[PDB]
Amino acid sequence: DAIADISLIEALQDDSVKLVLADTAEDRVWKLTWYLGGHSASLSELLPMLQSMGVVVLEERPFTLRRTDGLPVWIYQFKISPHPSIPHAPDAEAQRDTAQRFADAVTAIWHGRVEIDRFNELVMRAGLT
Amino acid sequence: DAIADISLIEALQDDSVKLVLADTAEDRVWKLTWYLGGHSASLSELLPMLQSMGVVVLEERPFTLRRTDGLPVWIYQFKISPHPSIPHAPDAEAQRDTAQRFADAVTAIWHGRVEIDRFNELVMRAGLT
Lengths: 129, 129
What we know:
The structure is cut from a larger assembly and holds two copies of chain A.
Chain A: H1 2-10, E1 16-23, E2 30-37, H2 43-52, E3 55-66, E4 72-82, H3 92-110, H4 122-125
PDB class: oxidoreductase
Keywords: large glutamate dehydrogenase Mycobacterium metabolism, oxidoreductase
Entry title: Cryo-EM map of the large glutamate dehydrogenase composed of 180 kDa subunits from Mycobacterium smegmatis (open conformation)
């Protein structure tokens, strides 16, 4: 896990943001790793963005460290679960596409390019960008 | 810390709730220990109650264990900060009274005896129950 972590950490820039969404070994539970490259963010603003996605926030674990150039970076492990009414993935390809769309959507939400509303849930419902 | 923890844990009952609010060694930062005696609660419902209090949720740390009678209990450490416009405590007595009112208010919020709105902020603003 250290190889993937330092690779994503080094690829970050000033005030950069990275997300990786994977599935937990159990059923209907996902792990989202959220990397903040330079500045820390509180949960009261980080949670509503994921709430608009339609998933339920279950657990959070914070971490932090310093990069090679002295840039402090933060890592947040989110154990989340999507809404039961959300359809499943017929294959691994659908899971991969949904993960990519989810990461891009939340990244857009953080930058303020969109609004915070339940319309975002359609990304995981109708398979839209 | 173990003496105070097991004392509060043993005093709990089925589906009981306990809160202890203390001040961190730094300035304008508080630590709230939230003990759930029997059932686990997600952050998506535990956070709005504290949001209505007027404080900003900064960090959360989860823990769990089993009691002597086999009852599983959960502990949540919340590192929070009140709103800057909220007045300070002129003495330790005001801090103690505010902590007692805060604990009682949030305990009432969890039981559903009140509503979730910004009116609750007056508890920490005008010193009301």
